[PDB]
Amino acid sequence: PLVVAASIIAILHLILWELDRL
Amino acid sequence: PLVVAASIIAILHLILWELDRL
Numbered sequence: 001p002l003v004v005a006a007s008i009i010a011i012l013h014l015i016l017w018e019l020d021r022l
Numbered sequence: 023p024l025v026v027a028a029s030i031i032a033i034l035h036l037i038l039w040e041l042d043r044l
C-alpha cells in the first residue's frame with residue numbers, strides 16, 4: 001500500500017509540474 | 023526508490039502519530 005501511495009504521489013508531482021508549466 | 027519512499031512515508035506516519043499523542 002505505501003508503494004502504491006508513493007507511486008500516486010509521484011504522479012501528482014508530475015501533474016502539478018505540468019499545470020505550473022501551463 | 024519507491025521502496026525507500028514507502029519506508030520514509032511509514033516512518034513519517036509514526037513520527038506524526040507520536041507527536042499527536044504528546
Ligand SMILES: CCCCCCCCO[C@@H]1O[C@H](CO)[C@@H](O)[C@H](O)[C@H]1O
Binds near residue numbers: 013014016017020
Ligand atoms: C505547503 C502547501 C503547498 C504544497 C506545495 C507542494 C509542492 C508542489 O509540487 C510540485 O512538485 C513538482 C516536483 O515534482 C514541481 O516540478 C512543481 O513545480 C511543484 O509545483
Ligand SMILES: CCCCCCCCO[C@@H]1O[C@H](CO)[C@@H](O)[C@H](O)[C@H]1O
Binds near residue numbers: 031034035038039042
Ligand atoms: C499515505 C500518506 C502519505 C503522506 C505521509 C506524511 C503525512 C502523514 O499525515 C498524518 O498526520 C496525522 C497528524 O495530524 C498523524 O496522526 C497520521 O498518523 C499521519 O499519517
